[PDB]
Design a protein around this ligand. Structure first.
Ligand SMILES: [NH3+]CCc1ccccc1
Ligand SMILES: [NH3+]CCc1ccccc1
Ligand SMILES: [Cu+2]
Ligand SMILES: [Cu+2]
Ligand code: NA
Ligand code: NA
Lengths: 620, 620
């Protein structure tokens, strides 16, 4: 019944039929993105209209199309031809992964490069990497992937241990031409394997770990209704899933007494970018937007009980479309469970004699995705006390190169002859805020140091200052860890019992933002990543910080174009965009498979409640 | 057998006998600190000499003494009279907590103040607060506590809800005189109660929480031998306990193959300070060093199975001395257990077809302490992958005041008429480093941004730079979150298989340091808290960042005096001192009992191992 329900296999089948009948799904068509559209602002009509957005690619070289379809009215709403030289290429297709290796395998320039290195072409894997936009005029308007080669010694070998450096090729995947092959020199292919399941490398496995059993004998404390609506410990929300963004959280609310109070209308990771800091011409073009270019949701793993998710697990199995419009289930793609989280509140009072201890817990909603060498877990946490937290968990295999004789300022050595270029992993969280309703504002809060003197005679005073962001042109903010800078999202029309505006405080990790030179191509295409915090006025079509078509777009789309409208954001329907990321100087311990590292952010209530919201928690 | 074993009740009894026989424990004596001394550098003699350090107070007004005693030779090693006007007062005694209220209860100035407010003296609780050093010349050389009053309406009432503002008294607890009573005006005593176990306030308790059962059917994976030696998942260490510092970790090492490799020789929280930022004369003197002035270990809680520590728990029950030299057990004062910690490493490889997932876990060693209104949990974590992490958990009841009519720049309103002054909680971790041995050095690592140009034609390069700290005068460092600043502790004489020095990287949270004016009394007494990182050359007597006698010391002792020696720290026996803390602007949700907030730091291996140290972990 809910307009926020997951897409069903039946809905996907109808979309395919509607497209087919209208002539838009010929044998040369490929669906490059399919996703349900959110209800527009003003759903108080209950006139449910399930609409879907589709990007249609053409393998014969015709112009792609963007198409909106109503499964509720069996109609094509709109269908527009796209000029990709203008607005960007469509996301990479999964079936294009192997096309790069196959086209290179018959190219004479490629075979001469491999032969000079004594490499058997049947052993050489080619990574299908997004191309970006650089100096090559012949690439404008064409669908280009770039290829870097790795050697597999045998079918189960980890190819990442054997990069073929000094060699890169560019490929046009529509016309099937190899446009350039660049060979800058021969590097020894690193010889050690990185097979982390080989007993030769692992040694004897440990026998010292004894099992930890986590069970819920009466089942979990949360309920799931309508397929994806969650209620847990006064929290209410809908769990959505989009093939581009992955897990999306809708309608986050908290039941404060008899009142259901909204907090966040929509929460997602709307983009992520991995820029590499190696100036070698072999890799200096390398940046991928896993979300915008590859679509992280379509590579979600099936999560195994006991290994990936431990405890009393409830699974969701989202449905997406394959390239031909058929539905495919991602079995067990989303794990949901509650976890004990230590002490929530504790006090032993000397004067009253009362000893008080309560335990905390959190609700976990998570998925894992794999794009090539990288694996990422996305975790949303809801805590008893009103805190919301996101955590990214980065693991998988680092992207490798040769380690140059005589070292490098931009590459780490992981093993003899084997290097790992410096890079970042940068995320954009899009938080469509709804603190007690849609009239919200953002204040920047800094600690204020005070000078010893009149009114502060012992020099101990300190304070804080809050600056309201009133227009989009002043809502592009940087972190300042030294002044304890945070941002408060408040509702000036909703007050707590002290007559102060209710609010939530955003706590950032204050990691470095984009390191690239501001005049670089990546700084223009990933402009969102140059600042920690952006606030925009809500608008239906402003979904991604990089725009709708990230692949090979020349830059500027998204956030910098949105905020130039300079709209009013002081007590309006606003969206907060938080940039956060990891700067990764690879270490020896990251090899041959990387232990998880983490980054994220959290939001805590700031005078949202009239007192602690966990006074009614019982004693275990 | 181990020289690092916990003190036994029998050892305490011998100390008391030795002191008594030597004439040092007369009926006017009080033991204000008793603790075992660490073995000196050069324990390779195995000549165990269990020595204890004792601070002896005299309630009749004689000079206190510092005494060292060998329980191994039944001898007083040394006994020195202390000039407290010079070197500071002894730590607050527990029996002095009630003396402040009792002395005030018969003072005419105090009774006139209470009578003007219609307060029954039998309802008025007085907090025994450390005095610091300010402008009062009469206080030099005397043992002073200051008193702030709270009203208890009935024996089980939370007094913190009813501060008596505009009133403070200073008391000499040795001569039992009230030296001053300051009344700056009448404030209404806030009327609402803060009784968080009152059904009137909590409402009906939740019935929606279902149990989480954590068990280990074959017992825990770690072993405890010799009372306090832990082995777990290649980690080895001794858990110590000191009445001042609390849990202390000794001899942290990791078994890498057949080799036991040291990492940290001694880890402790060596000081913590809570400065208040309210310039009102009633509170502008308020700073307490919970560790140095009050001794956090002697207020450790007895931790309850199921409430405080959940899972398969192993307890340690440390023994300390009471004020008369009798041993007292802190039953169940330290909890130890292992916890599941999610995914450790994961990759699904497109080319080899191998799907790989391993789970992480951590070893937890924790205690909780209560000093007045505040409750703090101290947690040490050891992870499978070599990471060491500390976390402080702050809860309890916020310190309160009246909320002034017309507001305040330095106080938060929590309830009608009830305020909570701004303050910080700042910790000092003392890490006596032993990375693969005692020859260590510290490098500061900053990210380096590079300009687009020759050698960096696409403007994507970035790098990092490391600066060796060679002398103590240059080893006082500040954080810089914007440049991703970290510190690496390495051993230049111990290399990994890549011929690079083995190391560990310290990751700070980069929270604000001490906010007080640098010319303030607190900035002089808590000088350590003004900078994020200090490195000193190890020396036996350099134990605390504030010196041995914090109470009423005039400032400068500790770290600023140590580093003026300007000793060589480049490949030497060094000690890292990390300042970290929380800046607390109290929120409504902190009232009437505060949900836990956290701060801490972590150390991760940086080329310490020759590859990931968790390749031998098995598949669940
Ligand atoms: N993460 C997207 C880049 C990528 C895609 C496929 C293989 C290796 C790398
Ligand atoms: N934390 C040390 C200060 C303190 C001590 C006792 C009661 C209230 C406050
Ligand atoms: Cu990385
Ligand atoms: Cu606090
Ligand atoms: Na909004
Ligand atoms: Na050392």
């Amino acid at each position: 019944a809910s307009p926020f329900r997951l897409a069903s296999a039946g809905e996907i089948s109808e979309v395919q039929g509607i497209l087919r009948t209208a002539g838009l799904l010929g044998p040369e068509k490929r669906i490059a993105y399919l996703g349900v559209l959110d209800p527009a602002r003003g759903a108080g009509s209950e006139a449910e209209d399930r609409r879907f957005r589709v990007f249609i690619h053409d393998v014969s070289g015709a112009r792609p199309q963007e198409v909106t379809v109503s499964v509720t009215n069996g109609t094509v709403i709109s269908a527009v031809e796209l000029d990709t030289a203008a607005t960007g290429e469509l996301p990479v297709l999964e079936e294009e992964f192997e096309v790069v290796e196959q086209l290179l395998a018959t190219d004479e320039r490629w075979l001469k490069a491999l032969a000079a290195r004594n490499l058997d072409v049947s052993k050489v894997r080619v990574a299908p990497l997004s191309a970006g936009v650089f100096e090559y005029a012949e690439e404008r308007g064409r669908r280009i992937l770039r290829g870097l080669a790795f050697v597999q010694d045998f079918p189960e070998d980890s190819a990442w241990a054997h990069p073929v450096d000094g060699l890169v090729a560019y490929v046009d995947v529509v016309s099937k031409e190899v446009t350039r092959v660049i060979d800058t020199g021969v590097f020894p292919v690193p010889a050690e394997h990185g097979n982390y399941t080989d007993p030769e490398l692992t040694g004897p496995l440990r026998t010292t770990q004894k099992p930890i059993s986590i069970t819920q004998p009466e089942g979990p404390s949360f309920t799931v209704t309508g397929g994806n609506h969650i209620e847990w410990e006064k929290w209410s929300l809908d769990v959505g899933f989009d093939v581009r963004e992955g897990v999306v959280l809708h309608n986050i609310a908290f039941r404060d007494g008899d009142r259901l109070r909204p907090i966040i209308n929509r929460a997602s990771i709307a983009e992520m970018v991995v820029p590499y800091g190696d100036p070698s011409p072999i890799r200096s073009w390398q940046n991928y937007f896993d979300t915008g270019e590859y679509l992280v949701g379509q590579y979600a793993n099936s999560l195994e009980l006991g290994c990936d998710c431990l405890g009393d697990i409830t699974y969701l199995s989202p449905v997406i479309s394959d390239a031909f419009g058929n539905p495919r289930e991602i079995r067990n793609g989303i794990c949901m469970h509650e976890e004990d989280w230590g002490i929530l509140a504790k006090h032993s009072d000397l004067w009253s004699g009362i000893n008080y201890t309560r335990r905390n817990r959190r609700m976990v909603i998570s998925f894992f995705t794999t794009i090539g060498n990288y694996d990422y877990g996305f975790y949303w946490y809801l805590y008893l006390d009103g805190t919301i937290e996101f955590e990214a968990k980065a693991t998988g295999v680092v992207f490798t190169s040769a380690f140059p004789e005589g070292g490098s300022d931009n590459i780490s050595q992981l093993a003899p002859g084997l290097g790992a270029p410096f890079h970042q992993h940068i995320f954009s969280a899009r938080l469509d805020m709804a603190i007690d309703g849609f009239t919200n504002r953002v204040e920047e809060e800094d600690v204020v140091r005070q000078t010893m003197g009149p009114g502060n005679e012992r020099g101990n005073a300190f304070s804080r200052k809050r600056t309201v962001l009133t227009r989009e042109s002043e809502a592009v903010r940087e972190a300042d860890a030294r002044t304890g800078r945070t941002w408060i999202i408040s509702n000036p029309e909703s007050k707590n019992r002290l007559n102060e505006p209710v609010g939530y405080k955003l706590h950032a990790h204050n990691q470095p933002t984009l390191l690239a030179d501001p005049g670089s191509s990546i700084a223009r295409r990933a402009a969102f990543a140059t600042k920690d915090l952006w606030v925009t006025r809500y608008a239906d079509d402003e979904r991604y910080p990089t725009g709708d078509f990230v692949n090979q777009h020349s830059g500027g789309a998204g956030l910098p174009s949105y905020i130039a409208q300079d709209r009013d954001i002081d007590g309006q329907d606003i969206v907060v965009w938080h940039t956060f990321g990891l700067t990764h100087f690879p270490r020896v311990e990251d090899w041959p498979i990387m232990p998880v590292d983490t980054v994220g952010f959290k939001l805590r209530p700031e005078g949202f409640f009239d007192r602690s919201p966990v006074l009614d928690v019982p004693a275990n």
